[PDB]
Motif scaffolding. Structure first.
Motif, PDB file in Angstrom:
ATOM      1  N   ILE A  10       0.822  -1.094   0.082  1.00 46.09           N
ATOM      2  CA  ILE A  10       0.173  -0.006   0.134  1.00 46.09           C
ATOM      3  C   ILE A  10       0.888   1.443  -0.075  1.00 46.09           C
ATOM      4  N   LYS A  11       1.919   1.178   0.771  1.00 43.43           N
ATOM      5  CA  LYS A  11       2.923   2.495   0.923  1.00 43.43           C
ATOM      6  C   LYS A  11       3.516   2.543  -0.569  1.00 43.43           C
ATOM      7  N   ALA A  12       3.787   1.633  -0.997  1.00 46.70           N
ATOM      8  CA  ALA A  12       4.709   1.658  -2.597  1.00 46.70           C
ATOM      9  C   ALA A  12       3.647   2.259  -3.346  1.00 46.70           C
ATOM     10  N   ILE A  13       2.423   1.759  -3.660  1.00 51.00           N
ATOM     11  CA  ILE A  13       1.254   2.462  -4.199  1.00 51.00           C
ATOM     12  C   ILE A  13       1.104   3.943  -4.095  1.00 51.00           C
ATOM     13  N   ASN A  14       0.770   4.114  -2.770  1.00 52.06           N
ATOM     14  CA  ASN A  14       0.695   5.458  -2.502  1.00 52.06           C
ATOM     15  C   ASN A  14       1.714   6.585  -2.901  1.00 52.06           C
ATOM     16  N   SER A  15       2.893   6.008  -2.343  1.00 50.12           N
ATOM     17  CA  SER A  15       4.151   6.951  -2.814  1.00 50.12           C
ATOM     18  C   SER A  15       4.400   6.710  -4.248  1.00 50.12           C
ATOM     19  N   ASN A  16       4.422   5.831  -5.020  1.00 51.90           N
ATOM     20  CA  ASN A  16       4.490   5.951  -6.412  1.00 51.90           C
ATOM     21  C   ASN A  16       3.450   6.548  -7.089  1.00 51.90           C
ATOM     22  N   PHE A  17       2.210   6.544  -6.597  1.00 55.22           N
ATOM     23  CA  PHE A  17       1.288   7.238  -7.569  1.00 55.22           C
ATOM     24  C   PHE A  17       1.423   8.550  -7.227  1.00 55.22           C
ATOM     25  N   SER A  18       1.928   9.048  -5.808  1.00 57.31           N
ATOM     26  CA  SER A  18       1.870  10.361  -5.749  1.00 57.31           C
ATOM     27  C   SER A  18       2.782  11.236  -6.301  1.00 57.31           C
ATOM     28  N   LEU A  19       3.973  10.590  -6.649  1.00 57.66           N
ATOM     29  CA  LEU A  19       4.859  11.300  -7.364  1.00 57.66           C
ATOM     30  C   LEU A  19       4.749  11.137  -8.952  1.00 57.66           C
ATOM     31  N   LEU A  20       4.141  10.118  -9.355  1.00 58.47           N
ATOM     32  CA  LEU A  20       3.476   9.957 -10.705  1.00 58.47           C
ATOM     33  C   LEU A  20       2.602  11.119 -11.163  1.00 58.47           C
ATOM     34  N   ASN A  21       1.378  11.198 -10.210  1.00 63.30           N
ATOM     35  CA  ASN A  21       0.266  12.102 -10.108  1.00 63.30           C
ATOM     36  C   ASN A  21       0.787  13.651 -10.405  1.00 63.30           C
ATOM     37  N   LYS A  22       1.942  13.901  -9.575  1.00 62.53           N
ATOM     38  CA  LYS A  22       2.463  15.379  -9.487  1.00 62.53           C
ATOM     39  C   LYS A  22       3.048  15.525 -10.917  1.00 62.53           C
ATOM     40  N   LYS A  23       3.959  14.918 -11.495  1.00 64.85           N
ATOM     41  CA  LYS A  23       4.353  14.929 -12.773  1.00 64.85           C
ATOM     42  C   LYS A  23       3.158  15.067 -13.722  1.00 64.85           C
ATOM     43  N   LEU A  24       2.310  14.283 -13.944  1.00 69.79           N
ATOM     44  CA  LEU A  24       1.302  14.188 -14.846  1.00 69.79           C
ATOM     45  C   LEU A  24       0.429  15.579 -14.721  1.00 69.79           C
ATOM     46  N   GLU A  25       0.155  16.108 -13.552  1.00 74.59           N
ATOM     47  CA  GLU A  25      -0.712  17.264 -13.405  1.00 74.59           C
ATOM     48  C   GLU A  25       0.343  18.632 -13.793  1.00 74.59           C
ATOM     49  N   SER A  26       1.509  18.355 -13.869  1.00 73.94           N
ATOM     50  CA  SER A  26       2.534  19.468 -14.325  1.00 73.94           C
ATOM     51  C   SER A  26       2.406  19.601 -15.721  1.00 73.94           C
ATOM     52  N   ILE A  27       1.960  18.552 -16.415  1.00 75.57           N
ATOM     53  CA  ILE A  27       1.849  18.612 -18.046  1.00 75.57           C
ATOM     54  C   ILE A  27       0.748  19.133 -18.557  1.00 75.57           C
ATOM     55  N   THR A  28       0.908  20.331 -19.485  1.00 72.02           N
ATOM     56  CA  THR A  28      -0.302  20.888 -20.036  1.00 72.02           C
ATOM     57  C   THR A  28      -1.023  20.178 -20.948  1.00 72.02           C
ATOM     58  N   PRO A  29      -2.426  20.171 -20.897  1.00 74.62           N
ATOM     59  CA  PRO A  29      -3.248  19.267 -21.465  1.00 74.62           C
ATOM     60  C   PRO A  29      -3.054  19.003 -23.007  1.00 74.62           C
ATOM     61  N   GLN A  30      -2.664  19.951 -23.830  1.00 74.74           N
ATOM     62  CA  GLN A  30      -2.353  19.891 -25.217  1.00 74.74           C
ATOM     63  C   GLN A  30      -1.063  18.883 -25.351  1.00 74.74           C
ATOM     64  N   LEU A  31      -0.271  19.264 -24.678  1.00 70.85           N
ATOM     65  CA  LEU A  31       0.971  18.400 -24.744  1.00 70.85           C
ATOM     66  C   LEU A  31       0.769  16.960 -24.497  1.00 70.85           C
ATOM     67  N   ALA A  32       0.033  16.667 -23.461  1.00 70.74           N
ATOM     68  CA  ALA A  32      -0.198  15.444 -22.989  1.00 70.74           C
ATOM     69  C   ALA A  32      -0.724  14.339 -24.180  1.00 70.74           C
ATOM     70  N   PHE A  33      -1.443  15.055 -25.135  1.00 73.16           N
ATOM     71  CA  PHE A  33      -1.771  14.340 -26.228  1.00 73.16           C
ATOM     72  C   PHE A  33      -1.030  14.032 -27.363  1.00 73.16           C
ATOM     73  N   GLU A  34       0.138  14.799 -27.442  1.00 75.84           N
ATOM     74  CA  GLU A  34       1.155  14.509 -28.464  1.00 75.84           C
ATOM     75  C   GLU A  34       1.977  13.084 -28.366  1.00 75.84           C
ATOM     76  N   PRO A  35       1.941  12.516 -29.657  1.00 75.46           N
ATOM     77  CA  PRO A  35       2.516  11.065 -29.596  1.00 75.46           C
ATOM     78  C   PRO A  35       4.272  11.162 -29.647  1.00 75.46           C
ATOM     79  N   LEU A  36       4.708  11.413 -28.329  1.00 72.59           N
ATOM     80  CA  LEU A  36       6.005  11.655 -28.348  1.00 72.59           C
ATOM     81  C   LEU A  36       6.846  10.605 -27.553  1.00 72.59           C
ATOM     82  N   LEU A  37       6.049   9.560 -27.020  1.00 72.03           N
ATOM     83  CA  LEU A  37       6.790   8.331 -26.242  1.00 72.03           C
ATOM     84  C   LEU A  37       7.019   7.123 -27.026  1.00 72.03           C
ATOM     85  N   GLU A  38       8.189   6.651 -27.184  1.00 70.11           N
ATOM     86  CA  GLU A  38       8.428   5.430 -27.956  1.00 70.11           C
ATOM     87  C   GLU A  38       7.540   4.454 -27.312  1.00 70.11           C
TER      88      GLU A  38
END
Length: 169
Positions: A10-38
């Motif tokens: 549970i701690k791993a899930i919570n702590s991993n998600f929290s870091l992930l979600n911070k990164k995700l919500e820093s990404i502007t919505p338009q850029l989030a839909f660009e096909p840029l990841l291999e």
């Protein structure tokens, strides 16, 4: 060491998600839909939104395994219609499953809701059930859950970091 126990999972899930979600919500919505990841298949490419869609789909699938189990049904691993060696196609299913969610913020809310449901699922099991025996083979129940939540969350965080190679530009 990966989690070896209910509380660690549970701690791993919570702590991993929290870091992930911070990164995700820093990404502007338009850029989030660009096909840029291999993608892992050569010459394939995905968006951040596809990546979130992937995480939701795996979470929903984990929840589905346990829903099947509770109802006394036999779980089809990884998913009905799929072998484990068809995982790329299962990934494509997940992109399609959430591709109509055009608004980035709405996609992120769905991800967070899924994560919370996953934690509530885990809380329903004791440590002995999660990590004390095997489930469908030598892998414990907790391990199978970890594989498809805490681990992809961490990996996704890393992928976003590497994409940042061009974001603050």
């Amino acid at each position: 060491a990966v989690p070896s126990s209910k509380e660690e999972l549970i701690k791993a899930i919570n702590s991993n998600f929290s870091l992930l979600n911070k990164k995700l919500e820093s990404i502007t919505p338009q850029l989030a839909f660009e096909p840029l990841l291999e993608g892992h298949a050569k010459g394939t490419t995905i968006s951040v939104a596809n990546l979130v869609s992937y995480l939701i789909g795996w979470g929903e699938l984990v929840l589905h395994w346990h829903d099947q189990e509770a109802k006394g049904k036999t779980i089809i691993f990884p998913e009905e219609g799929f072998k484990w060696n068809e995982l790329g196609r299962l990934a494509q299913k997940f992109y399609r499953d959430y591709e109509d969610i055009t608004e980035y913020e709405v996609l992120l809310a769905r991800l967070k809701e899924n994560k919370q449901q996953l934690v509530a699922l885990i809380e329903r099991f004791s440590n002995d059930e999660l990590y004390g025996k095997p489930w469908y083979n030598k892998w414990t129940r907790g391990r199978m859950i970890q594989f498809n939540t805490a681990s992809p969350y961490k990996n996704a965080s890393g992928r976003l970091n590497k994409l940042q190679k061009c974001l603050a530009e």
